[PDB]
Design a protein around this ligand. Structure first.
Ligand SMILES: Cc1cc2c(cc1C)N(C[C@H](O)[C@H](O)[C@H](O)COP(=O)(O)OP(=O)(O)OC[C@H]1O[C@@H](n3cnc4c(N)ncnc43)[C@H](O)[C@@H]1O)c1[nH]c(=O)[nH]c(=O)c1N2
Ligand SMILES: Cc1cc2c(cc1C)N(C[C@H](O)[C@H](O)[C@H](O)COP(=O)(O)OP(=O)(O)OC[C@H]1O[C@@H](n3cnc4c(N)ncnc43)[C@H](O)[C@@H]1O)c1[nH]c(=O)[nH]c(=O)c1N2
Ligand SMILES: Cc1cc2c(cc1C)N(C[C@H](O)[C@H](O)[C@H](O)COP(=O)(O)OP(=O)(O)OC[C@H]1O[C@@H](n3cnc4c(N)ncnc43)[C@H](O)[C@@H]1O)c1[nH]c(=O)[nH]c(=O)c1N2
Ligand SMILES: Cc1cc2c(cc1C)N(C[C@H](O)[C@H](O)[C@H](O)COP(=O)(O)OP(=O)(O)OC[C@H]1O[C@@H](n3cnc4c(N)ncnc43)[C@H](O)[C@@H]1O)c1[nH]c(=O)[nH]c(=O)c1N2
Ligand SMILES: O=c1ccn([C@H]2C[C@H](O)[C@@H](COP(=O)(O)O)O2)c(=O)[nH]1
Ligand SMILES: O=c1ccn([C@H]2C[C@H](O)[C@@H](COP(=O)(O)O)O2)c(=O)[nH]1
Ligand SMILES: O=c1ccn([C@H]2C[C@H](O)[C@@H](COP(=O)(O)O)O2)c(=O)[nH]1
Ligand SMILES: O=c1ccn([C@H]2C[C@H](O)[C@@H](COP(=O)(O)O)O2)c(=O)[nH]1
Lengths: 209, 213, 218, 220
C-alpha cells in the first residue's frame, strides 16, 4: 500500500516484503526487544552484513531509461522490465538547472528537450504505421523514455544501492529514486535503517534529508 | 511446516514472500487462474526463469557438515550458520542406520558399521570435551570432530535458484543424505507454489526422484 | 590474445584478454577425482562428458575480457547478464561522439512497408541528426552533460569492457544467439561465439553438440 | 608456478592470472572515453579508484589458485560466493592420510592444564583412529561417501579457486584479519603475497586506502 511519485511521471511502489528487523535477528542467531535492537546496531557496526540478506523487498518502479541503466548495474538483485520489442518521457523542470550558468534560460532548455521528445515520438509512430517493426522503430526514442520494472532485492543489497545512489555524486534523478527507496526501507525496517545511517551508510544525502 | 530428516536433521520453513502470482505479476510488470497457470507453464517451457526470482523462501536447516558443504556450494542464495569458534558444540552426529548400507555387499554386518561409526564419533567427542576443559580454545579443539557433526543454518533462496538446487540435489546421482533434504525442500516448495512446482516437474526439472514421489 | 570483429555499421567486439583454455576446465574437473591432466583423447572426451551431463562449474575457470562497441538498446539487453563484470562509457562524464546505429535498407527484408526501406533509413538518420545537434547546443549553453544527453536516442553507440567466464558466456549464447532475440544482438552473439570457438575449440564444439539451446549457430 | 607452503601440509599455488594493474586502468578510463596514458598517470588513477571506492574496474583482473587446506578452513573460505570453486570429492576419491596437526606453538598464548605437546598428540591419536576406521570401512565395501563421515575436520582437501581482484580484496578484508581464525589468516597471507606480486600498484593502493583488516599492514 505504499507508492511515492518521483520526477514528473515516475514512481516507486512497494509490491511485497519478506521479514522485518527481526528476520535479521533470527538469522544472526540461527534461531526460529532492547536486546534485539542492540544486536541490530551491533551487526551493523561490525560490518556483519549477511543477516540483512534475509529481509527482501519487491518494488515496482517507473523510471526513465537513463535512470534504469544506472539502476540495473546493481547485479545482486532480480529485475523484470517492460519490453520495447513487445509512451511518456521525463521532461526536467527549469529548477533542474538552477545552480548552473546557462547561456539559454532554464525554461528554454525544458522546451528543447520537450521538442525532441515530441519529434522522436512522432517519427517512431510514423515508422510503426509504415510497417516498420517495433523493435526497429523504437531505436529513435530518447533516453528519457519512461520504462517500468519489478525489482526484488534483499536489505543488504538495498543498503549497497543506497550507499552509491543516495549520494550527491550520483545523478540527481536517481538520488530522488534512492530517497523513495530509503523511505520505504525505513518504514519496514526502522531498526536496521536507523543503525545503517548511524554506522554503515557511506553517502551524504540521507543524513541531510 | 517442519520436516524431520535423517536421524536429527530437519528442514523448517521460516518465511516466504509471494506465491505463483508473484511470478505472474513480474513477468507482466503490473488473478485469472487458467490464464496465469498457462503463463507459468509458458515461462518454464521457454526457459524464461527470471520471473520466478521474485518468490523467495527462508528455511532453517539442521544437517551434518558433509551435507552442508554440498549445500553451501549453491552460491545464488543467502546463508547464516552456527560457529564453530563461538559456541560449545552439541553431541549431535549423523550415525547411519544399518538400512543405509544393507543393499551393499559388505564383509561385516551393516549393524557393526553403525557401531564402528558411533564408537569413533564418541571417541572424537570425548577428546574434544577434554581439550575444551583443558583450556584449548574451541576453534582449535573442534578440528578433531568428524564430518557427520550436525550444524544449523538459515537459508534464504528465491524460487529460481531453489529449482536449480532441486535439479542437482533431488537426483539419484547426488548423495542419498542430501536427496532426503531435497525431498523436504520440494514438499514445502510444492505447498507454497503448486503451479510453479507442477510446471517445473513438467518442463524444466532435470532430476529423477521428484517424479517418483 | 587479440581479435576484433566489426558488427552493424560502426560497432565491434574485440577480445582484450583471456585466462585459461579447454585444459583449464579439464584440470578443474579432474581435482574431484584427485587427478590432473591426462592425454588429448581422454581430456577431450572429458570436456564432452562434462557438457553432456550439465557439469558446468569447471568451465567457470575460463575467463574472457571483451571491449564492445554497441548501441544502447543492445547494451541494455546485454547488461541484464548479471554474472559478469562491466565498465562503460559515461554520458555523465564524457561528451558523446556523433555515432549512431543506422540500419541499412536490408534490415527491413520481408517486411511490407508503406515507404521504401531507404526512406526508413533516412528518416532514422534525420531524427538522430536532430537529436544530436540539440544535445550539442544544450552542451554549448552550459547544460550539464548528464542532463543534455537525455535527448539522445537508443541507437547511440556506447563502449564497454565485459569480463565473463565460459559458463556465463554459454548462458549468454543460449539466449542471444537465437532467432527469437533481436537481430542486432544476434549479430554481437555471433561475434562472441566466433571468438569463443577460436580460444576454446573443444568446449565450443561440445557446447554446440550437447548443450547449446539456440538455433543460429548451426 | 608460485607455490607457498602453509601449515604442515598446506599450500596456495598460483595457477593462472588474467590482466594486471593496467587492466583496471583501461576499464576505468572507458568511462571518460579514454584508454591508457602513462606510468605515473595510470598508477595515480589506481590510487584514486581505491580512495574513492570505485571497485568495479578491479573485476577485470582475475586469478586462479590451487589450494590445499583443512576442511574447517575450506568451509570458511567457500562462504565467499563471488568466486568459482572445484574441489576434491570424498564421494569419488579414496582420501589420503593428510591431516592438519597444530604445532605446540599454536597453543601457547593460552593457559592449559596439559602441556601443548600433549594437545598435539591427543589430536594425532584421534586422527589416526578415525583414519584407520575409515580405511576399515572402505575395505569392507562401505561406499566411500559414507565411510568418509568419520574423518575429522582437520582433513586436508584441495580445490581450484578462480576469483577476480575486487572479490579477492573482499576476501583479504575478512580473512587477513586478527578476528579470523589463525589458520585461515595464514592462507590469506600467501594469497596477499601472490596478489602483491602480480598487481603491485593495486595492492599498495588497497593497503593505503581500502583494506579493513589489520595484519597485512604489519606482515610484509
Ligand atoms: C528473446 C529474449 C526476450 C526477452 C529476454 C531475453 C531473451 C533472450 N529477457 C531477458 C531475460 O529475462 C534475462 O534478464 C536475461 O536473459 C538474463 O539471463 P540470466 O538471468 O540467465 O543471466 P544472468 O547472468 O543474470 O544469470 C546467469 C545465470 O545465473 C543465475 N542467476 C544469477 N542471478 C540470479 C538470481 N538473483 N536469482 C536466481 N538465479 C540467478 C541463473 O541461473 C542464470 O542462468 C527479458 N527480460 C525482461 O525483463 N523483460 C522482457 O520482456 C524480456 N524479453
Ligand atoms: C572473522 C569472521 C567471523 C565469521 C564470518 C566471517 C569472518 C571474516 N562469517 C562469514 C560471513 O557471514 C560471510 O558469509 C562471509 O564473510 C562471506 O562474505 P561476503 O558475503 O562479503 O563475500 P561474498 O563473496 O559472499 O560476497 C561479497 C560481496 O558481494 C555482495 N553479495 C554477494 N552475494 C550477495 C547476496 N546474495 N546478497 C547480498 N549481497 C551479496 C556483498 O556486498 C559482499 O560485499 C560467519 N558466517 C556465519 O554464518 N556464521 C558465523 O558465525 C560467522 N563468523
Ligand atoms: C556516482 C557514481 C558514478 C558511476 C557509477 C556509480 C556511481 C554511484 N558506476 C557504477 C558502478 O561501477 C557499478 O556498476 C554499480 O555501482 C554497481 O555497484 P556494485 O557492483 O557495488 O553493485 P552490485 O549489486 O553489482 O554488487 C554489490 C556487491 O556485490 C559484489 N559483487 C557483485 N558481483 C561481483 C563480481 N562479478 N565481481 C566482484 N564483486 C562483485 C561487490 O562486492 C559489491 O559490493 C559506473 N560504472 C561504469 O561502468 N562507468 C561509470 O562511469 C560509472 N560511474
Ligand atoms: C551429483 C553431484 C556431484 C558433484 C557436484 C554436484 C552434484 C549435484 N558438485 C557441485 C557442482 O560443481 C556445483 O558446485 C553445485 O552443483 C552448485 O551448482 P550451481 O553453480 O548451479 O549453483 P549456484 O547457486 O552456484 O549457481 C546458480 C546459477 O547461477 C549461475 N552462476 C552463479 N555464479 C556463477 C559464476 N561465478 N559463474 C558462472 N555462472 C554462475 C549458474 O549458471 C547456476 O545455474 C561438485 N563440485 C566439486 O567441486 N567437486 C565435485 O566433485 C562435485 N561433485
Ligand atoms: O534479448 C533480450 C531482449 C530483452 N532483454 C531485456 C532488456 C530490458 O531490460 C528488457 C526489455 O528489452 P527490449 O529490448 O525493450 O525488449 O528485457 C534482454 O535482456 N535480452
Ligand atoms: O555430490 C556432491 C559432491 C561434492 N560436492 C561439492 C561439495 C564440496 O565442496 C566438494 C566435495 O564434496 P564431497 O561430498 O566430498 O563429494 O564438492 C557437491 O556439492 N555435491
Ligand atoms: O571466521 C569465519 C568463521 C566462520 N565462517 C563461516 C563458515 C561456516 O559456514 C560458519 C561457521 O564456521 P566456524 O569455523 O565453525 O566458526 O561461518 C567464516 O566464513 N569465517
Ligand atoms: O552515475 C552513474 C554513471 C554511470 N553508471 C553506469 C550505468 C551505465 O551502464 C554506465 C553509463 O552511465 P551514464 O548515466 O551514461 O553515466 O555507467 C552508473 O551506474 N551510475
Amino acid at each position: 500500500h505504499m507508492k511515492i511519485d518521483i520526477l514528473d511521471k515516475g514512481f516507486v511502489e512497494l509490491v511485497d516484503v519478506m521479514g522485518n528487523d527481526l528476520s535479521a535477528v533470527r538469522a544472526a542467531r540461527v534461531s526460529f526487544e532492547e536486546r534485539d535492537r542492540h544486536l541490530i546496531e551491533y551487526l551493523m557496526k561490525h560490518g556483519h552484513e549477511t543477516p540483512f540478506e534475509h529481509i527482501v523487498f519487491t518494488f515496482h518502479v517507473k523510471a526513465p531509461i537513463f535512470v534504469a541503466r544506472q539502476w540495473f548495474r546493481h547485479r545482486i538483485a532480480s529485475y523484470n522490465e517492460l519490453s520495447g520489442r513487445y509512451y511518456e518521457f521525463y521532461i526536467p523542470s527549469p529548477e533542474r538547472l538552477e545552480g548552473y550558468k546557462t547561456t539559454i534560460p532554464p525554461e528554454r532548455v525544458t522546451e528543447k528537450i520537450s521538442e525532441i521528445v515530441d519529434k522522436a515520438y512522432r517519427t517512431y509512430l510514423e515508422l510503426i504505421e509504415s510497417g516498420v517493426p517495433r523493435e526497429v522503430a523504437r531505436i529513435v526514442l530518447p533516453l528519457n523514455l519512461y520504462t517500468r520494472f519489478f525489482w526484488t532485492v534483499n536489505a543488504r543489497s538495498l543498503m549497497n544501492f543506497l550507499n552509491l545512489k543516495a549520494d550527491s555524486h550520483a545523478q540527481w534523478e536517481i538520488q530522488q529514486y534512492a530517497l523513495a527507496i530509503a523511505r520505504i526501507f525505513k518504514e519496514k525496517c526502522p531498526w536496521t535503517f536507523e543503525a545503517f545511517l548511524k554506522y554503515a551508510y557511506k553517502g551524504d544525502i540521507l543524513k541531510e534529508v
